[PDB]
Design a protein around this nucleic acid. Structure first.
Ligand SMILES: Nc1ncnc2c1ncn2[C@@H]1O[C@H](COP(=O)(O)OP(=O)(O)O)[C@@H](O)[C@H]1O
Ligand SMILES: [Mg+2]
Ligand SMILES: [Mg+2]
Lengths: 319, 178, 228, 305, 228, 294, 222
DNA sequence: TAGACACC
DNA sequence: GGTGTCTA
């Protein structure tokens, strides 16, 4: 309906992959900058890079082609060794189409280190037939694409929206998750659990639809499941409050609670202590937490090593 | 040669012209600076604080490290590069030492054969295998085991020892003096 | 179904165009390079009695040649391919159609812009010489009232200025200049004689070689030029 | 002012053709006429090091000006297989007439190319009589010592204050003529000499920016982190860290590389302890994004430059 | 000694089992894979007249085929091998026995648990097909009153569930189920017809292929089941 | 039992079976206990005191189970070596149907970390045919998922009863070989003064016949010289964990009270950072100078 | 000119001696290894009608074999080579003579120091065995009243002490010892029977193999 | 099959 | 150093 369904797919983050550029949830400018492209009908050489997965890169690549009725060659970037670029990719950039269809090569996940030579071989190849065929590169890490290549492409960078844009996207994503539940026969009890998914892992709209699949085990999102979404990345308040109060009994007890995922917790901690504390204490909170994080995995008892952080912080932090 | 009054033809002409690439390849190889002279070239720069770059050069984190540790004035920086040195760029680990150690002045293969030999025969680690060379060379003098175990030298086995003509020189050495 | 030595001959060839194939019940087989730069089609004497996708077509054909000719290919109980010999039974995997590139339909070829022919031994010399001179691109063009093919080495000569090879197909009646460039890498036709039908509309272009056994359409490169 | 038509980038499309049309310092220009008059080109390595001065451009034009038979090969491309086949082919393959054979090897200072270098030093002993070699380098140390022997290495750069004054003028005047062909408009002529100043050395850089701005047919990288460490702020650094979490091993390498030059000698000894210790403990560290944040602060504190 | 074309035929085969060999004066040759997973033995028509270890047996055999058949192999003055031709003399190195792997003795094969036969062209199809289908393990088992061989690709199918190839050797009289798994890598027998003798005691097992020219014993894999 | 050809006493007299080894009470019975079942699980035999002859126990358990046994120097077990030889070995059912047992000696060598992880799926892969026996000085060098598929058996603390009884066993055994080797017994307190000198390490004591004190270093630190120290460092690189313990022990008595507080900061800090330190030999050198100074 | 299958057979061989060749109008072709250690000369049935240097002779010959036999090789309008077929025309580059090594003149071979012969299948065994035993140097010498060839592997045996191969050419009448060493790398002769003429003056030496189709001189030392 | 490059 | 990947 208002949502594309690949319908040959059970996997559901992919059953629901947007077919066009409108159905795509993107920042205001990049959507217009993409709308702009599809209207003119001839696509430039683009790099869409995340890094963080799930933002729309390889969906937008396919959509640009759909919307232009491109003659598209989709290609696993890992498979592009230099012989493949000299061979089939050349054979294609050179060919005359004729359906009167603009040719697009989509090289997916082209950010590999050792495809450096295939990359140097494109920098000549991209100009030679830019008349005939345009190249869309998708990457997680752009530094793995050589400069001369970036330089030949418009580099559009995903996943860093403006707070205004960030808000609109979270409204549209929530709206989407709904329309997807509708079609999957999932009943939505609380709507709070659906927005919590959208916020919880935001940049990434894949996990975001992945988490949703995860929770329909009982086909309902009730407050009983809303209780679940709060907990995993949930409130650091109990600790944040005990650090202010500078007491031990509370801290000593809170430490074993978070022993489980230290890598996640320590991240959330630095995040919320940064705002709530003095500028001078920011420089210190990083030395303390950085040093702690750094030595986790050396440390025998992780529960205690976390205790050691808390005291260290209550002493030197001021607010 | 067999044509008298030929012209000149240096080593390089003969190679390239005839197109055997082993001579051309060896012709390229001869020009390059000797490994040992590079290792000496470097150590002195850190020390006497003079110019040079690497990456035109063969670099052993070990060597500089070791060779440097020689003077107790160097030892503080050799240490830091020691704990920390892993995963620094060969190039970095260069520049640390450079701006680090202030002043300046400065001043196995065969056994491996014997050892990896001994461990393979008796099915034991490379640790006892050292103690086994010891217990023999002193006592029993062990050409006599070097006699029984000359038996296994197989050409394949040489490749695990070393990568070059240095290996087939060994092949014989141990076919020899026992 | 059973496949004659001629059909497998043909099929081995198609395999050079694309590593897989989609075979559909009927007397017609076709394939297209994944990059869409070369298309082949043929009528065959044997009747294919079930739809099947084959992922490695070269592998499949190798196996065939290890059985007798009467070996009866059929659909497997679980759906894969079953090659049944006198005393032996082989099982080859059917492929998910969504993983093998196939042409959509056989689009009719536009009435020809230019028509000529190429003799079996000339096509052979062209291919063979091509490896030796390192000719990676050729140009069917007009010179002195005749249709000629000119080979060039595009790595060493960017513009296609220096002509390493030339072959004269036949005289040319029309008044039109056309310089039709082809990528050697895309001349996959099995050796034989071919009616050659050239066609162009603006920047679009394609050449259809029409043989006794099959047809091949192959893209003319973007730098092809014409008066059509 | 010469135009190679059918060329896309202006830096490819406007490529000074003659050693005269190249914009150069005092000695440097006289030097190449000095050479172009003797009608023969010795073994040469032009090295910049600061880019965009015109290495590869002087190289090609030295061929022109002597009416060379030129073979132009980029350094990334000149390979153990190429030196043996095409290069040798051209040297020993005979051009009749006058033309002199010259093999311009571009950007031959490249990490893995040192074998292809040795193979050429020998080549030069082999084929020098029948051709002559011009290699181009950003860093000469990218070249083996023996190529620096049989090659005359002329070093670019450093125009005198006189030259600066008179080169600017030529890149300003030269910028007008491009824009005349291009149909780009110059709204302010002080804004064109704003660009000839802003990046002065860099003659190649000035032309890419110009393409960028003609969007409306008129005139008006670790950098992000390196800049945030100088500014010593956190908000920026804190935000930049997750960006590079992906490949830490690569990033931390690039970082030590560029901070080494940009910082004080005493801070070099420290930047290594800091980065070395950090790199060392990556893979122990739970949260790699934070562990990277921990590096940045540590660096902004102790680095001074 | 002199070696006939049949003997060297045999010897070349053994060379595939193990790169070296230990030859002992007599009419009997034998070898075993270094890993002990395949053993071969044959009586030969020629008489070997001296003990010698050969390190590269394939190389030695190549040289032989470059001399006349009457070429007389003997012990060298210094102990190595001397191949003496009409006008020519070749010298090949004797190897330190301590460097070449040999079986201790020819252990008698236990009376067979099961007996069948395999025809020369069926063993050939099996080997040949095997490279094409990528069958790296086979199973001699019972189906429908007959002894069959089933090939499987163990990398893609861990359990040996999907059967890529099946060959029917002959009917089976007994009532026992046995699933005897063999590693393709260990079927080194030179082409020909073979009595096939299967034997198992609990987790132990082996299969002896008994041909006209030689015998081959080859280990059955861990997964092997049976009620023998 | 002798192997009457072989060239080394420890090798020629190696106890064939599990009784013939000189061991602790609880330890022999545990090992009897295992072979009793006639099939060996995955085992880690761990020392850490050397010359207690891990690889000897192991070579033994294999013999008592009548297992076909592949040996590997731990140093040598590299990723690809595991991929072919071991897998070649691990895979095939044996004509004689013994158990295949891979003994990997001293798996606590270094970059072998990766071959360790390759092995996690492997060990579950061939369970019927095969078992592995890992030999370690320090368990923390065997990765935890390997520790989990394995019985960890941990060697010896001879009871005072063990002490004496082992002692008599080491005299009547050593007696017996000097017999076979036709060596003269001039005194019978010279035999037993060997069984005592290095006690828990017999493999050692037999290697003396086939022909430590920290004194050399302790003396060089007093003398405050480098040449000697610099040279002594690589000697003890092997076991740092043991040596550093012995050092703090004897320097504590021989030095001033104020220097005791310092010797601990210095050695503690050094010990603490071993395992971070690239070159262990040098890191040990760095300790020695630091100590001679303060 | 046109070249018969026999001439191109010959020319392919010469290509193994030297990668290029200098062809001169006439019925006579010749070449020499760049290093001067092996020289070949042959009269051919076809007549070469123009002077031309060919840089890659192997490449040229491969091309030839892709055309009919009647294909007419001529000088190109711009001077390079033009191979003209029935319907097709190929163009191969002429080479600057200054880049290709040719012999000056055929120098008469000195009356032989020693004379023997080598049978076609013995020369074949020698070459073939040579790759397998790794014989990189051979010695024509005297043993027990007969001329023999002894192969050695010079990398593994420096002195030429251990003889891996020996072939007996014929008995030897004279009383002279000569140990004539040859480099396998220089035995380029096409297979066939050869009169073998050995010659030496002091440190100088050469061996001339005289076959039905061509002659080969190849350097020794003694 | 090596050496170049990259990551532990 | 080890392991992996790629281009030659
Ligand atoms: N010195 C110069 N004079 C004129 N143009 C220049 C000069 N340097 C760079 N350019 C512009 O940049 C283009 C290529 O310059 P190049 O010489 O490759 O730069 P680099 O110094 O990095 O080799 C030229 O076509 C030209 O328009
Ligand atoms: Mg993607
Ligand atoms: Mg350039």
């Amino acid at each position: 309906s208002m949502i594309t369904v690949n319908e040959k797919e059970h996997i559901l983050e992919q059953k629901y992959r947007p077919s066009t550029i409108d159905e795509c949830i993107l920042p205001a400018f990049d959507k217009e900058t993409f709308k702009s492209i599809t209207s003119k009908g001839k696509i430039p050489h683009i790099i869409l890079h995340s890094p963080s997965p799930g933002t729309g890169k390889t969906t937008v690549a396919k959509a640009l082609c759909h919307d232009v009725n491109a003659d598209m060659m989709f290609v696993n970037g890992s498979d592009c060794k230099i012989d493949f670029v000299r061979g089939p990719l050349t054979n294609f950039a050179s060919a005359a189409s004729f359906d009167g269809r603009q040719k697009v090569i989509v090289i997916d996940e082209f950010d590999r280190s050792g495809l450096a030579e295939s990359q140097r071989h494109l920098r000549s190849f991209m100009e030679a037939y830019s008349s005939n065929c345009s190249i869309i590169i998708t990457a997680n890490n752009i530094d793995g694409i050589i400069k001369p290549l970036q330089s030949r492409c418009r580099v559009i960078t995903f996943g860093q929206p403006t707070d205004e844009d960030k808000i609109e996207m979270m409204k549209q994503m929530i709206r989407r998750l709904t329309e997807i539940c509708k079609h999957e026969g999932i009943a939505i009890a609380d709507m709070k659990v659906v927005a919590a998914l959208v916020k919880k892992n935001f940049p990434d709209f894949r996990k975001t639809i992945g988490e949703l699949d995860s929770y329909s085990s009982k086909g309902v999102l009730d407050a009983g499941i809303l209780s679940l979404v709060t907990n995993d990345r949930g409130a650091i308040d109990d600790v944040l409050e005990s650090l202010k109060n500078k007491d031990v009994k509370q801290l000593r007890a809170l430490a074993p609670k978070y022993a489980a995922d230290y890598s996640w917790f320590v991240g959330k901690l630095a995040e919320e202590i940064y705002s709530r504390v003095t500028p001078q204490s920011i420089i210190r909170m990083y030395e303390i937490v950085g040093e702690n994080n750094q030595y986790h995995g050396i440390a025998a008892n992780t529960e205690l090593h976390l205790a050691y952080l808390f005291i260290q912080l209550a002493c030197e932090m001021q607010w | 040669s067999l044509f008298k009054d030929d012209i000149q033809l240096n080593e390089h002409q003969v190679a390239w012209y005839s197109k055997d690439w082993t001579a051309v390849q060896s012709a390229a190889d001869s020009f390059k600076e000797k490994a040992e002279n590079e290792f000496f070239e470097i150590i002195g720069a850190i020390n006497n604080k003079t110019k040079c770059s690497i990456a035109q050069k063969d670099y052993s984190k070990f060597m500089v490290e070791n060779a440097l540790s020689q003077f107790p004035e160097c030892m503080p920086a050799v240490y830091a590069m020691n704990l920390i040195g892993s995963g620094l760029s060969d190039e970095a680990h260069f520049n640390y030492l450079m701006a680090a150690v202030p002043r300046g002045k400065r001043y196995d293969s065969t056994e491996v054969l014997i050892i990896k030999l001994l461990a393979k025969r008796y099915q034991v680690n490379t640790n006892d295998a050292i103690n086994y060379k010891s217990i023999l060379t002193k006592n029993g003098k062990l050409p006599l085991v070097l006699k029984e175990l000359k038996g296994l030298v197989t050409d394949d086995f040489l490749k695990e020892v070393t990568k070059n003509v240095k290996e087939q020189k060994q092949l014989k050495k141990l076919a020899l003096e026992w | 179904m059973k496949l004659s030595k001629d059909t497998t001959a043909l099929l081995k060839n198609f395999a050079t165009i694309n590593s897989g194939i989609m075979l559909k019940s009927g007397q017609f087989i076709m394939t297209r390079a994944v990059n869409g730069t070369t298309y082949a089609e043929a009528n065959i004497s044997d009747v294919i009695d079930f739809d099947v996708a084959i992922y490695d077509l070269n592998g499949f054909l190798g196996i065939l040649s290890l059985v007798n000719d009467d070996a009866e290919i059929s659909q497997s109980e679980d759906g894969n391919i079953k090659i049944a010999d006198a005393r032996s039974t082989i099982f080859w995997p059917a492929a998910d159609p969504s993983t093998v590139v196939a042409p959509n339909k056989p689009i009719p070829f536009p009435v020809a812009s230019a028509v000529t022919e190429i003799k079996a031994e000339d096509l052979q010399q062209l291919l063979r010489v091509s490896r030796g001179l390192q000719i990676d691109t050729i140009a069917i063009t007009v010179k002195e009232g005749k249709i000629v093919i000119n080979g060039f080495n595009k790595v060493e000569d960017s513009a296609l200025t220096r002509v390493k090879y030339s072959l004269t197909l036949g005289d040319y009646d029309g008044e039109n200049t056309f310089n039709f460039i082809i990528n050697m890498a895309n001349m996959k036709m099995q050796p034989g004689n071919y009616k050659l039908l050239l066609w162009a509309k603006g920047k679009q272009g394609a050449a259809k070689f029409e043989g006794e056994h099959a047809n091949y359409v192959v893209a003319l490169e973007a730098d092809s030029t014409h008066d059509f």
